[PDB]
Design a protein around this motif. Structure first.
Motif, PDB file in Angstrom:
ATOM      1  N   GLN A 631       0.852  -1.195   0.000  1.00  0.00           N
ATOM      2  CA  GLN A 631       0.000   0.000   0.000  1.00  0.00           C
ATOM      3  C   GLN A 631       0.884   1.240   0.000  1.00  0.00           C
ATOM      4  O   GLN A 631       2.108   1.124  -0.052  1.00  0.00           O
ATOM      5  N   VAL A 648      10.403  -1.353   6.335  1.00  0.00           N
ATOM      6  CA  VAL A 648       8.976  -1.074   6.338  1.00  0.00           C
ATOM      7  C   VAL A 648       8.726   0.038   7.340  1.00  0.00           C
ATOM      8  O   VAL A 648       9.475   0.181   8.307  1.00  0.00           O
ATOM      9  N   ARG A 649       7.831   0.963   6.960  1.00  0.00           N
ATOM     10  CA  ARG A 649       6.736   1.513   7.765  1.00  0.00           C
ATOM     11  C   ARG A 649       5.973   2.508   6.924  1.00  0.00           C
ATOM     12  O   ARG A 649       6.261   2.633   5.742  1.00  0.00           O
ATOM     13  N   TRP A 650       4.989   3.180   7.504  1.00  0.00           N
ATOM     14  CA  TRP A 650       3.826   3.616   6.750  1.00  0.00           C
ATOM     15  C   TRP A 650       3.577   5.097   6.868  1.00  0.00           C
ATOM     16  O   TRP A 650       4.360   5.825   7.459  1.00  0.00           O
ATOM     17  N   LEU A 651       2.445   5.523   6.355  1.00  0.00           N
ATOM     18  CA  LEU A 651       2.183   6.917   6.090  1.00  0.00           C
ATOM     19  C   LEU A 651       0.759   7.101   5.599  1.00  0.00           C
ATOM     20  O   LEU A 651       0.197   6.177   5.017  1.00  0.00           O
TER      21      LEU A 651
END
Lengths: 811, 811
Positions: A631, A648-651
């Motif tokens: 995503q 990994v990490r998100w937003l």
């Protein structure tokens, strides 16, 4: 001609040259540098500094007074300023060292007073008390103010201000309230940017540069009757014989000293045949804290450039505080001798820590290879030392490759050696390669996978080993969808007929396979059936099967007597610059992971994907395979050896949705096919930490990626657009300058309405996207609707963030 | 009784006490501390360490050997370990200092060998080479192993191992392969956690603790015929007269030295009437590097506790390397004298930097106020110094308040003084307060605003001045919605009739207003019409209107002859613990900003909201007013003085949506009204940086907030749930322990099925939410469906993230 210098009669590092020949090692453990190489390191932001001043009478700017240096970035500019000064806020110890400017609040606009070397309530009376400003001495100027400020036009001639230092003593001179009288004649518009505070001190004595560099002593010539120290500053290429000392003394080249008795802080002067042969300087009761040349004994004299003796001079030298400037090619010979054995001792360092010369910069790659007689078969040998940093091992092997290609000889074999070493570098290394009897399906089912498609907003080729090298990158990209279907969708099924059929669409007749032959693994015929070959590289071996006994493979595995028939679909050609090949392969592997078994993870799916992407032999554009599967983020490529891969990490997106609607986004133009890419991944893997300012620009791509994620992590959509256009600049004008001028015609119009863009991924074909204000955007759709429409059509395509992206196995 | 100590015959800070009386200043610039206060600072993680060992024979644990200390957190525990050791990886200099354990890979499980003070290829033979482990000496134990390990049971008695240090010399003793023989008798299950590397060195000489504390010299008694230094370690309460020295010497109390000739590194022994009176120690040719007591002259003796003289002893003392332990209340008097003028010189420091004692910890608030004669009217005076950190000014005023309340006298006036100072502290200060003639509406329109409602997942009372104090907090919360409408929705309209009607629903008859009277500003009658009063505090003044000429106010402003009638709606009572009051007020202000004019920002809306929330006189639960207006994050409360308030950036939700569906969330139980809150915001504002471990726990609430956002910034939903339950623990068991046991019955069942929860916001009423696995969650809905159902009903309510939340002005 450039900055010649000042008098500067304090530092003993002032052999009768300019400012380019007091060689000092680098922070990354190489000794091939000085201000001249460091001047180049500052020249690169200084040649970056030029923007919209003048024609050919613009400038090629005079260098500074060298408060030391190489903290963070300049600009330090607005393009309508004559002069932009530097500000620095530190403890007032460096106020007591050197002069601080101070003015009204706010100070960084137009200076009103100063105080050179402030002390107490005087410094408090620099109202307001904490409006400090310490310049370091590189300013712009208009096309006019040369004739007033530096070299003031008089009736005699355009004479300088009688301050020999123009910059510092003009800022001492004009920086007071006479600026409010004087700078109003020559386009008064001036702004000031201050600075951060990393590595800013001065060059008083040798211990200043020692403290700057934290440590000393690299050539290392160790003759005998010498004294072991550390703190003493010996640079490269000084044969050090027969003399006993205490530290703080520095000795360059054209200097073979024998049998003296010397103490701290020594200038040692060159330009001459200096031995204890004909200079006759042996019984040398040499004092402390003085500067060679000539001082055999005595107390605290001043003798400059090489006054001549035999022995007689040893008497009237306790006559202290006298001035005798001893002067009214062999220095270039010192430089030539110094650069002679430099690659020799680089080979010694390529033996010593075996990458201490090699995988520290390798910066002079071609000149290291060719000049002078550096035989990089030693680099092949230490490449095959046992096993190393295969980073450094393959780096040495590629240094061998760089020589063998670069000198003349076996570039193709040099490329082959580098290629095999590149593979072997990535051949490391993963669990398992396994043996697993997949089972699941079961028969009647159909497993259908599917996947969205990344683009990369920023964080460009910080992917793609060689990364930094190792380590890491970061990309943060997105993972989005074309209108429907996601596309990139894969069907896979059991059958009756023990021959694994690969079946494609937009190209595919079939690929009837059971041979393996190897397995699979084919860069052989680039029917992209090639990619499912590697998709059978699960391991793809095991006990205890065989070539005929794919019969056993299937028909105990599935068991389901297929000879499995697997049927992909891509919607877009690989000339996308959307990583579609890589994503596609990965998606197949996810389908296998569902399909008949083996139970994996998204991440380790991508791990094993990258693993086979090695043997796929495309440069691993690798950002994508995490991107388009997951995503709208990626983020954090971190470790990249060997090659380790979290990331990994998100937003939130969220301004790609809840949509903006200040457009509410960006969308597509091909009119342009790709070239496709045959030079690009070369320039990537030419090179590793070998070359060049590539490595530099790469690093702030990473920086700009963190810039990106923080930006839209706050939601600065307008600035999101800035950073997009920056990334475009950051690759177009940068690596790689391949974007073919038809693209630039599609840029040309528009550029306008409103804001920026990029080509995702590859560049040199494929298609852009770009952001505007808001419905002027739709009028841009009207613009590309109007013209510029080849049959590679010219669309809105959106993009359409929509994402999870995986599979079904329905029902 | 606890850790008495070892011999430790190196450090001169070993006056004949235990380990509690060598007073050393704090890093935040107060001198009221030693190991004893620092032992308390380590005791707090040490009393944190206890979990599930035994009944009353559990332990109250022996303190360590004091490698120095106070780096990051222990645990350093699993509840089935006998012993957990400490690991440390530093440069091998501290390997050469003290002993390192090393074993197989992986090392932190069960030790196999060691090497005390390793050197070269020996240290390399600690296979594997980089499996280092340096303990610092506080271990657990089972309920059994006391009788073997420390104090081994023999036939004579349960004698200790003859190692006097049990811990260090047992780990030296048993840490080799005899552990693989020996620790298998006493529940072999052992795990090891290593440590980070902040402030870990030893206590060899005084310069160790000097380097630890970076600086010295606070009482400061400066008598005459003394010598000015800095580096010398003088603690509190040592009258320093008539003696000349070099640094490195340390002097406590019950010590009034006059007329000696001393050098470096001095123990100076107490417990006695020591002057140059009766001890007769004047003509003192005192050597260097030795320890008082008695050594008038000579070379390198060893005299312990106070051997007696007159003068005669000055001769046979050049007899070096001899041992004469000079020994076979007045120290407690030294402590009592030392603590006598401590508050006196604290008042001096409350004059000196005027918060250097006050707003540095103020930690001993009640004992500072009461004991002994600290008159905090001086704190009122220096509170009104001129103006200060109004932080520190109001801190001093509140110290005065803390005295006047705490001693006996005028607590209500002390509270009044603190209240007014608290207001004055927040009275600073904002643009403008303006004058603006709002116009917009226009007539026919209706402006309708609306807003979602925060909860705070973590990041609890890191809001709410006093914050840290200043600075900042961070909350990251969310901003979500009850099923529809958002609620909290406000209507506002022009009319005909020049009397500003406030009109409410669920309570509201009306509020006919034009008087102002002040303006508005009413904590007067708490008809929550109170909140719209402050909503008229736009400024709410201007030129050149008057009381009757609200006629002018409206009827040039709107002009639209309203006497505006404004009609809110809340759905939920203020007993929500959802900040609904604050959010509501803010939303009204957004409606005003639309309504008739003045053109503001979300952020400055919230700014001015908080500004009036001051005069609203509720404790500013302030997290919410950014939270519930904006969308699902907050994050970063940062500056909090005076009070500065950014705080923004974002996060994906996304696992509150695309929904999880591993439940796919959390949702509601009131059965419980609130108390409501009348003690809670007291415990908040009792106190500032005055007290206590509150400030401590507050700080890791902030830490746990960054924990939170990183966690779900990666998407660790399972760990998101952990951190939620942690925050619950972090407030329930912590400040504030008010959650009333009916709540705990709703916790009771369930706690189970699966995971944690919290009360948002207030606590002590209102309603929770909680996360489970997945549809067991719906079975929890069946559980609360089953029982525990008062008429405050027991619902699913969701929550429902849905958010932007603003207004319409339609049409």
């Amino acid at each position: 001609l450039l900055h010649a210098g000042g008098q500067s009669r304090r530092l003993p590092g002032y052999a009768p040259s300019g400012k380019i020949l007091t060689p000092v090692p680098v922070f990354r453990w190489e000794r091939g540098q000085h201000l001249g190489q460091n001047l180049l390191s500052l020249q690169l932001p200084l040649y970056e500094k030029i923007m919209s001043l003048a024609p050919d009478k613009l400038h090629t700017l005079i260098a500074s007074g060298d408060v030391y240096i190489r903290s963070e970035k300049p600009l330090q500019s607005i393009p309508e300023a004559d002069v932009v000064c530097y500000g620095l806020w530190v403890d007032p110890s460096l106020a007591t060292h050197h002069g601080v400017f101070a003015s009204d609040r706010k100070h960084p606009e137009q200076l009103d007073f100063m105080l050179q070397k402030p002390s107490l309530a005087e410094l408090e009376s620099l109202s307001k008390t904490h409006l400090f400003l310490m310049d370091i001495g590189i300013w712009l100027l208009s096309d006019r103010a040369v004739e007033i400020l530096m070299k003031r036009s008089h009736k005699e001639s355009s004479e300088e201000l009688k301050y020999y230092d123009l910059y510092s003593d003009f800022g001492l001179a004009l920086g007071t309230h006479p600026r409010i009288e004087d700078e109003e004649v020559n386009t008064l518009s001036v702004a000031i940017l201050p600075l951060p505070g990393g590595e800013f001190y001065h060059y008083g004595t040798s211990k200043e540069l020692i403290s700057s560099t934290l440590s000393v002593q690299n050539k290392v010539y160790d003759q005998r009757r010498i004294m072991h120290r550390k703190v003493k500053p010996n640079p490269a290429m000084f044969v050090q014989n027969a003399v006993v000392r205490i530290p703080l003394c520095a000795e360059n080249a054209d200097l073979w000293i024998e049998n003296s008795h010397i103490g701290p802080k020594w200038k040692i002067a060159s330009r001459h045949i200096i031995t204890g042969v004909p200079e006759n300087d042996w019984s040398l009761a040499v004092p402390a804290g003085v500067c060679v040349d000539v001082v055999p004994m005595g107390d605290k004299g001043f003798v400059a450039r090489p006054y001549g003796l035999d022995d007689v001079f040893k008497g009237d030298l306790r006559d202290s505080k006298t001035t005798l400037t001893g002067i009214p090619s062999a220095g270039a010979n010192l430089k030539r001798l110094y650069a002679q054995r430099e690659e020799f001792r680089k080979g010694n360092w390529k033996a010593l820590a075996v990458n201490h010369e090699k995988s520290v910069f390798y910066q002079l790659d071609l000149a290291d290879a060719a000049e002078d007689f550096v035989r990089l078969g030693l680099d092949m040998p230490e490449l095959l030392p046992e096993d190393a940093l295969q980073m450094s091992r393959i780096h040495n092997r590629m240094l061998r490759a760089r020589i063998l290609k670069l000198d003349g000889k076996d570039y193709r074999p040099e490329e082959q050696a580098a290629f095999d070493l590149l593979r072997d570098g990535l051949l490391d290394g993963i669990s398992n390669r396994k043996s697993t009897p997949k089972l699941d399906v079961y028969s009647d089912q159909i497993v259908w996978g599917r996947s969205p498609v990344r683009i990369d907003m920023a964080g460009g080729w910080t992917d793609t080993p060689p990364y930094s090298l190792y380590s890491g990158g970061n990309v943060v990209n997105l993972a989005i969808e074309l209108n429907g279907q996601p596309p990139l969708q894969v069907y896979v099924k059991p059958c009756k007929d023990f021959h694994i059929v690969l079946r494609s669409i937009d190209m595919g007749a079939m690929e009837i396979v059971s041979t393996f032959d190897e397995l699979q693994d084919y860069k052989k015929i680039g029917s992209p059936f090639s990619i499912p070959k590697a998709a059978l590289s699960l391991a793809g071996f095991a006990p205890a099967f065989s070539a005929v006994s794919y019969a056993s493979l299937e028909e105990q595995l599935k068991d389901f007597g297929a000879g499995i028939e697997v049927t992909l679909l891509a919607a877009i050609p690989a000339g996308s610059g959307l990583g579609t090949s890589s994503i596609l392969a990965s998606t197949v592997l996810g389908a296998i992971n569902d399909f008949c078994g083996l139970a994996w993870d998204k991440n380790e799916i991508c791990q094993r994907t990258l693993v086979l992407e090695q043997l796929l032999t495309t440069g691993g554009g690798w950002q994508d395979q995490y991107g388009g599967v997951l995503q709208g983020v990626k983020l954090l490529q971190t470790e990249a050896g060997f090659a380790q891969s979290p990331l990994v990490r998100w937003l939130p997106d969220h301004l790609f949705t809840h949509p903006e609607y200040k457009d509410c986004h960006l969308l597509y133009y091909t009119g342009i096919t790709r070239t496709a890419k045959g030079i690009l991944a070369e320039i990537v893997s030419s090179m590793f930490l070998n070359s060049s300012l590539h490595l530099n620009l790469l690093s702030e791509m990473k920086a700009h990626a963190l810039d990106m994620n923080e930006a839209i992590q706050r939601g600065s959509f307008v600035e999101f657009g800035r950073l997009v256009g920056k990334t475009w600049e950051q690759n177009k004008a940068l690596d790689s300058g391949t974007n073919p001028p038809a693209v630039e015609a599609i840029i040309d119009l528009i550029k306008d309405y409103t804001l920026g863009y990029k080509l995702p991924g590859a560049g040199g074909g494929g298609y852009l996207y770009m952001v505007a204000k808001d419905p002027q955007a739709a009028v841009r759709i009207r613009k590309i609707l109007t013209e510029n429409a080849p049959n590679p059509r010219a669309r809105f395509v959106e993009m359409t963030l929509s994402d999870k992206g995986f599979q079904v196995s329905r029902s």
